[PDB]
Amino acid sequence: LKSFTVEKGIYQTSNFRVQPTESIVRFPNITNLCPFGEVFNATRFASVYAWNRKRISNCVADYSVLYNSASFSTFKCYGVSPTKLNDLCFTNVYADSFVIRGDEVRQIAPGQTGKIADYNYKLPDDFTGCVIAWNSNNLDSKVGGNYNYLYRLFRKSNLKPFERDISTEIYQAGSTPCNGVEGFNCYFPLQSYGFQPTNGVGYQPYRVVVLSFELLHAPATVCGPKKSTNLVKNKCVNFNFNGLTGTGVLTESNKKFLPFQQFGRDIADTTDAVRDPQTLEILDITPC
Amino acid sequence: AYTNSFTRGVYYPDKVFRSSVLHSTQDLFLPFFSNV
Amino acid sequence: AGFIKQYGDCLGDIAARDLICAQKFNGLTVLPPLLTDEMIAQYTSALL
Amino acid sequence: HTPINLVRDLPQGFSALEPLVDLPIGINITRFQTLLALHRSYLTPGDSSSGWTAGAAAYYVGYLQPRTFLLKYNENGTITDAVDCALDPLSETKCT
Structure with missing residues (x-):
């Protein structure tokens, strides 16, 4: 009223409002998880030059799990x-898993150069995704040496991002025709890595998985997990x-909701x- | 050969449930009495 | 009518089938009339 | 899906089409083509010459057009009827 004196009557002073008791965050049931296990806990690893690319969608x-787990030496996400x-949530996710030397692990990042970055596995400057790597001295290394992993010495030009080149053909450095065989100025394009358990930290083979997350307008297939809470009824929440x-x-x-209809x-x-995402129950709407 | 698709071609525009209500919407539908 | 709506009965996407409840949601309130219907009848009885 | 003792032409009646699947393909499709199957019985020799039967079936194709419709929702949530307000003057009034 803006007055010290009030005349008799009924006056509307303020507004009554019940405050919310708690916050509930919900996302749908957890099932239909992407097979991370196949990538990380994989039995075999691909070479750097031709790496395995499994799309997750x-x-x-x-x-x-990947962030929390101790097993990985490093986990870095740029974007x-x-x-x-x-x-x-991302429209499409690609996992590029390959085994490379420890010293070279740093190369798997955007805006980098090197044997892998240029010729092997190139990343976009803009690259959005996370790189997870861990050592596999126990698994990959062989006393004799594990030759199985190759990288590329020569190419016509520099490699574009995410471009992989499996090709076995003999690279012709010089003028002489290779005709499919090595000789003067003709070399097999890839060289192997000699990993042995005895070697040092940098020397040790490391399994690296990079999860690129292409983001497009298109429907997003791969979304994050659901951190949900319990449902409480008959309370302003x-x-x-x-x-x-x-x-x-x-x-x-x-x-009675139809099987397809949500709200x-x-x-x-x-x-x-x-309709609760977890339980197929229909819960009616009431302002507190 | 052409026939008359009198009423058919109506599908639920969305997942949303509604009841005892008339909800207008514009979506791609087969026209009524269209030529098929 | 009745001026009493079960809160719980109400909470989700269906209660707004109950329009008043939905109105209850967005600050829209309906004040009751001072002279009740029963009261109104009495006048109508008296005037008559 | 409905059972019908239909005329070759489509039955006259109203029914909804519930959504079965939503695919994230995200591919631009200009055109389409339908596929049919052949039906061979024991009597027929297997060869492609003329031992094959396509069967009775027929299908119809129409095209969707951005239009305004009035959908009437049942107590159940199923749609009983619809009005194509584009169709006729009587219809145009219905939407308004």
Whole structure:
């Protein structure tokens, strides 16, 4: 009233509002996880020059295990926060796994040059993705030496990003026709790495997996995991179902939703009763 | 040969559930009484 | 009518089937009339 | 899917089409073509000469057009009827 004296009557002083008790964050059921195990806990590894590329899509990719796990020597993500992967979603994810020398591990990063970066495995300057690597002295190394891994010495031109060249053909450095065989000025294009368990840290073979996350307008297939909480009913709560958010008291409804349909709607165009992503229950909408 | 697709070609525009309501929307649909 | 709506009964995407509840959601409130219907009838009875 | 004792022409009646699948292909498709199957019985010799039967079936194709429609939702949430407000003056009023 802006006055010291108040005349008799009824006056509207303020507004009554129930505050929310707790915050609920939810994402859908965990199932249909991307096969990370196939990549990281893989029995065999590809060579640097021709690396294995497994596309990961149509799943809920749980990054947390890779970030948290001790087993990897390093885990670096350029484009996005490594913590963010659980929340972030990408249209397509490619995993490039290859075995390379320890000293060279640094080369797997955007804006780098070297034997791998130029000829072997090149990364985009803009590259968005994370590089995870660990040692495999125990697995890969051989006393005799593990020759199986090759990298490339010669090429017509520098390699573009993510371009891989498997080709076996003899590279003709000079004028003389190689005719498929080595000779003067003719060499097999790739050289092997001699990894042996005895060697030093830099020398040790390392398994590196890079998860590129191509981002396009196209529907995003690979999204992060679901950090969800328990459902509480009959209480004003701050709820966050898959797409939407709001505050109200979730109660059991007597509504029969179609198997495909997720959310109801008001005549008015409001959010009324929602289907819980975890449990196929229909819970009706009530402002607190 | 052409026939009349009188009523057919209607599919749910979205996943959203609605009830006892008339919801107008514009989507790609087979026209009524269109020529097929 | 009744001026009482079960809070819980209400919370998700269906309750807005109940339009008033939805209105309850966005600050839209309906104040009741001072003279109740029963009260109104009495006048109508008296005036009559 | 519905059972029908239909005329060659499509039955006149209204039904909805529920969504089975959503594929993330993200490929630009200009055109399409339908595939049919052949049906050979024991009597036929296997060869491609003339031992094959296509069968009775027929199909129809129409094309979608951006239009406005009024969808009537049942208590169930199934759609009973629809109005093509583009179609007729009576229809145009219905949307309004």
